[PDB]
From a paper:
[name].2 and [name] share ~85% sequence identity, and they both can be activated by hyperosmolality treatment. In addition to Ca2+, they are also permeable to monovalent cations such as Na+ and K+, suggesting low cation selectivity. Members of the OSCA family belong to the calcium-permeable stress-gated cation channel family (entry number of 1.A.17.5 in Transporter Classification Database), a subfamily of the calcium-dependent chloride channel (Ca-ClC) family.
Here, we present the structure of [name].2 from [name] (AtOSCA1.2) determined by single-particle cryo-electron microscopy (cryo-EM) with a nominal resolution of 3.68 Å for the overall structure. Each monomer contains 11 transmembrane helices, in contrast to nhTMEM16 and mTMEM16A, which have only 10 TMS. In contrast to nhTMEM16 and mTMEM16A, of which the dimer formation is mediated by direct interaction between the transmembrane helices TM3 and TM10, the dimer interface of AtOSCA1.2 is exclusively formed by its cytosolic domain. Despite the separate biological functions and low sequence similarity between the AtOSCA1.2 and TMEM16 proteins (~11% sequence identity between AtOSCA1.2 and mTMEM16A), structural alignments reveal that the last 10 TMS of AtOSCA1.2 share a similar fold with nhTMEM16 and mTMEM16A. The ion conduction pore of AtOSCA1.2 is in a closed state in the solved structure, as revealed by pore radius analysis. The conduction pore is constricted by a set of hydrophobic residues, which include I393 on TM4, L434 and L438 on TM5, V476 on TM6, F515, F516 and Y519 on TM7 and L575 and L579 on TM8. We have also identified two long helices in the cytosolic domain of AtOSCA1.2 that lie parallel to the membrane plane (named ICα2 and ICα3). In AtOSCA1.2, the hydrophobic linker between the two long cytosolic helices is identified as an unique structural component and may serve as a sensor of osmotic stress. In the structure, this linker protrudes into the lipid bilayer as an anchor, and its partial deletion impairs the opening of the channel under hyperosmotic stress.
Residue numbers in the entry:
A (entry chain B), B (entry chain A): 3 to 48, 70 to 276, 288 to 717
Write the structure that this text describes.
């Protein structure tokens, strides 16, 4: 379907450059300066179409770290890791595997019983290599030449990030983070509050340091009413400022009264339940607190060591950041966390079940050649030499992207059902859930449940006879669908995101209908963070499509390369200019990303075993079992030598930065800075 | 072979009671009071044949803990855990599975092609149940009724040991252990010694507490010469005290001179290389030290947390005990440890290879019925109705025990090749190595490489036809060999060890030939510890033989029960009276024992799957895959809720015991107690 892939990529490229032209025109308007330069406003300072790509590369990395942050820079380093990995894989896959496969005409042996393709398998892989053949001694050493070298890149980068983290976090500005420990669970007592329990624990066990504890209020209903009150005042602005350019009888459902008396009701509830939260309710005081110390060393001790007999009471997390704590999940009791997880492993098992139907509905539309040759009817979807290319190359990608346009938000809500009192861990487990959802339905339940449609004459006319051989041929045949998915979802989806329409339309609507001046900068935060819910494991999906199909057909490799090369420039321009970073992690997600790339390697070799086990290659599988040993052993090496720069904060640097801070500024209290830092953002 | 099993067990029992009579006679001699009551001498105090079993049960467990120790009591609790587990397994295996199997005469259908047994499979298991049958719905729920209940016992005991440990170690007497941390690796420097590196590290990072460091001398050659000097003075005592009851021309090889001038040579070397060890040799000062603190809290902090950037420098162990530190392995450089491990995984792979031949040489002797019916010759080993029982029931156990009479010492040496600077971890990894050696050669390479001999007519006359079915029948047929191995190795081996001949003969020889008085108490320590190299994973071998054959033939279960019931009384008498305990761990080996029993459970269900997959039991395997999920999930539960009472010493108890000790005795230094505690036992 190269006649189809060319048309699909042509539509995608000649729409993506339309997006670039629209961005180049619409950026230079003077009114949208608050949109496309919003982070510059957040830092407190007010023909030649693509003349922004060289501007986004002039700024060096340490100035970017001191300007943007440390999460987004290493997020760019994910894309540079992708460009580093897949360049020589594609180089050694062009000049080696393509002269191997183009020679032997085994799918020109097509009138073996029913296998009809055209002029693409001659560029494809092991399907074109016949049974028990001699060509496979190429691929396996190329397999080594892929998985030894990518482990070298994954070692070198994961060295240059732990060093990068330890250089950053031992020199960043003082937060009220590095002195504070969450004390998540605590046993009840006949004492009148949790506060004296935390006092008589930490005065006895940490008698020297112990700055000031702070318990966690419930405040769920109160914050929900504050959110509803602000939303109601937003509509009270909208309906009332329609009247300032109109006449009497304003609204319909006297009627402007029908929000302001509701405002009086809500304020009468606000003052009541804000009075009735910290006066008469010890019941609304959850068993948790934010303790605090006067050295970073003491908090580093307190939040790494076992505290008591039970490893369920007094357990200490690292107290994320006061602008990072996802409140209204500190109000979940601890003993009901493991229930809420086991619920959302079941419903996730449903989300890998209900979404199989919109997967297969794609591929039946994507391989109508696999239906026309398998079922005689042509007054329906018919070969017309051009609309076949549209129905097989463009609409499957658009359809599969539009079925995925909601599920990052769904998995974000589903992670919010569990506790995870930080945005910085909600986004990590949301990325993990969307990675599993891409690995099951977008990859496996696409390939297995679609290649049966793609070779339906094989399963139809001659059943249960060569059913390993047909499904072994059909998996490298299903690279064209991922080519189109790259060219639609990744390619134009990163080439169309620059024109940030979903915040810009809302910004114009809030310009046109609000009150007055002195408010035109709260909506510059409406472009949120980088997509770590959305765009983070999409990268790992393309890593999976690269590494799985690297000893398999190299027609996914150059498209992955140009996607990475474009998205690096796109996201680097975005991180320089339009991004917020509502949390400093800092880059504490590489034990997840590195692990998922290693799991992509392991799945790559375990699927290469399945592809070599369908051509009766006898002495080919024994020289491939060494790789799931070698990669998992390399992962256990990296889990020991580099990962405890991410988990365990060492005490030498915790004392070093403390003494350096007491050399920079002496003689300031921390109680004026940090005693009232973790009070709920109601108060 | 019940006619053979009865004769084997009769010989073993009627020799074991001969051992008990010899012990009862030889104990009441007045001269061996230093042997069979040696621990009572170590604690500083000077018809009715089996009248010692009720005496060994009168003493309650807390007095035993305050008398013997805390390792040996929980070592007895291993045997009581065995008696707790396998009693209702045998009860519910008699009254359920034996009326199932005795009914259906499918091995009385014996003239299916070549299968000849006699009157034992009617008591055995799934071999006697025919293909795709209805009896198996018993066994699987009995499988649940074994693996749910044993996990309850493994939860309850592992609760009553972590509580037992935390009650003991938070109330024991003061050692110079709980204040001391080994600092195993340290980077070099242009500074003149490692001592100033340890000083300028710990004064800066732990400025409050920091009692006194102590570096580790090399002292290998010096300690080897001290050992040779003491051995040479032992022979200098022996040859000279032969002269005190003889005449001139004493020895042969003037000749008594031929040891005393060698003594002068050795002392001239001792004073030289003891002078030339701490004066002119910074090269002989290894990069390690024993740091020390003045609170237990500070040492608990120092030996749980990451120290620096690298997790290879300044890494901190727990500094075992000064009478526990296996010296001359602190003199191994750290960077050469991982080489020495990877050597001794290879040679261990050789020890699982060379010892296959003495395994199979046993079973060919053990199943001559499987050779006579498979190879016509009878002027060799012949059926004579009694010597068949001797050659099949007694000599395989004796032969297999005598091939194993050296390998605990071999694995002890092999663990000494690695570093492991404690006896308390050398014995743990020696127990792990001997567990793997029992699981591979004594269990798997016995069963697979012997059942082929046991059904050699099946593999001979009709080959490659029912080779899953024959090897599925033959594995429950190979329970009689483990019956005899229990009755020889375990049974009489624990019933014959009471008469502790290997220290007693040496004690009589050292009484007859040494110098004078004032020396008759150093040889009471010659009975060493409990067998944790030798006798610890023998228990787990019988756990494996119980749990694997519990849904399989219950003719191993009562013999395991009476072995446990006898060995509990035997080892409890021994631990009360004759044992030393050269190290207090205290019971820090249950994450190993609990893990190996859980692995025995997992191997039990994964071999039960293999036994059900040989009778074409279709709807029997799907209701058995849940158990390797359930047991490993239970192991991940116990690794989280109970294990960090063994690994991570909590800080609340470390401050509690410190304040209680300062309430018991105030105002004593630790430098008079602990500054010179870890100097090498040369000095």
């Amino acid at each position: 379907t190269l006649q189809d892939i060319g048309v699909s990529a042509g539509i995608n490229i000649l729409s993506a450059f339309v997006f670039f032209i629209i961005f180049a025109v619409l950026r230079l308007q003077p009114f949208n300066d608050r949109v496309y330069f919003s982070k510059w406003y957040l830092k407190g300072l007010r023909m030649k179409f693509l003349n922004w790509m060289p501007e986004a590369l002039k700024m060096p990395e340490p100035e970017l770290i001191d300007h943007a942050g440390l999460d987004s820079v290493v997020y760019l380093r994910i894309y540079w890791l992708g460009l580093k990995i897949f360049t020589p894989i594609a180089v050694l896959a062009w000049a080696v595997l393509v002269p191997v496969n183009w020679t032997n005409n085994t799918l020109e042996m097509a009138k073996q019983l029913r296998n009809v393709t055209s002029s693409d398998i001659d560029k494809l892989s092991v399907s074109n290599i016949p049974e028990y053949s001699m060509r496979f001694w190429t691929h396996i050493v190329m397999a080594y030449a892929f998985t030894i070298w990518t482990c070298y890149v994954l070692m070198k980068e994961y060295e240059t990030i732990a060093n990068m983290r330890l250089q950053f976090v031992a020199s960043e500005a003082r937060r009220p983070d590095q002195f504070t420990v969450l004390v998540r669970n605590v046993p009840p007592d006949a004492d009148e509050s949790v506060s004296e329990l935390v006092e008589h624990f930490f005065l006895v066990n940490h008698p020297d340091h112990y700055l000031t504890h702070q318990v966690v209020c419930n405040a769920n209903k109160l914050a929900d009413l504050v959110k509803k009150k602000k939303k109601l005042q937003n509509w009270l602005d909208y309906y009332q400022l329609k009247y300032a350019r109109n006449n009497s009888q304003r609204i319909m459902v006297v009627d402007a009264i029908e929000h302001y008396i509701a405002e009086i009701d809500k304020i009468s509830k606000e003052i009541s339940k804000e009075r009735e939260e910290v006066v008469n309710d010890p019941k609304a005081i959850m068993p948790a607190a934010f303790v605090s110390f006067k050295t970073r060393w003491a908090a580093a001790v307190c939040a790494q060591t076992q505290q008591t007999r039970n490893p369920t009471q007094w357990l200490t997390e690292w107290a994320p950041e006061p602008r990072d704590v996802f409140w209204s999940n500190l109000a979940i009791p601890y003993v009901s966390l493991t229930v809420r997880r086991l619920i959302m492993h079941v419903a996730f098992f449903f989300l890998t079940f209900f979404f199989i139907v919109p997967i297969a509905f794609v591929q039946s539309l994507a391989t109508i050649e696999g239906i026309v040759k398998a079922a005689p009817f042509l007054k329906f979807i018919v070969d017309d030499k051009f609309m076949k290319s549209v129905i097989q190359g463009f609409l499957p990608g658009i359809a599969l992207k539009l079925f995925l346009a909601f599920l990052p938000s769904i998995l974000m809500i589903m992670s919010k059902f569990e506790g995870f009192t930080s945005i910085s861990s909600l986004e990590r487990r949301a990325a993990f859930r969307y990675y599993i959802f891409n690995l099951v339905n977008v990859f496996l339940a696409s390939v297995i449940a679609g290649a049966a449609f793609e070779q339906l004459n094989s399963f139809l006319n001659q059943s249960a006879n060569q059913i390993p051989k047909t499904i072994g041929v059909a998996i490298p045949m299903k690279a064209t669908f991922f080519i189109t998915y790259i060219m639609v979802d990744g390619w134009a989806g990163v080439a169309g995101e620059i024109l940030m329409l979903k915040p810009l339309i809302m910004f114009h609507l809030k310009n046109a209908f609000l009150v007055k001046t002195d408010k035109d900068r709260e909506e510059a935060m409406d472009p949120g963070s980088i997509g770590f819910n959305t765009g983070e494991p999409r990268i790992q999906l393309y890593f999976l499509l690269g590494l799985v199909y690297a000893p398999v057909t190299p027609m996914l490799l150059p498209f992955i390369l140009v996607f990475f090369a474009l998205a690096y420039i796109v996201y680097r321009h975005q991180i320089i200019n339009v991004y917020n970073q509502e949390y400093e992690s800092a880059a504490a997600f590489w034990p997840d990303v590195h692990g998922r790339v290693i799991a992509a390697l392991v799945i790559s070799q375990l699927l290469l075993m399945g592809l070599l086990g369908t051509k009766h290659a006898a002495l080919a599988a024994p020289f491939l079992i060494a790789l799931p040993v070698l990669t998992i052993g390399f992962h256990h090496f990296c889990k020991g030598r580099y990962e405890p720069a991410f988990i365990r904060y060492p005490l030498q640097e915790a004392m070093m930065k403390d003494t350096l801070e007491t050399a920079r500024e002496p003689n300031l209290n921390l109680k004026g800075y940090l005693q009232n830092a973790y009070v709920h953002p109601v108060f």
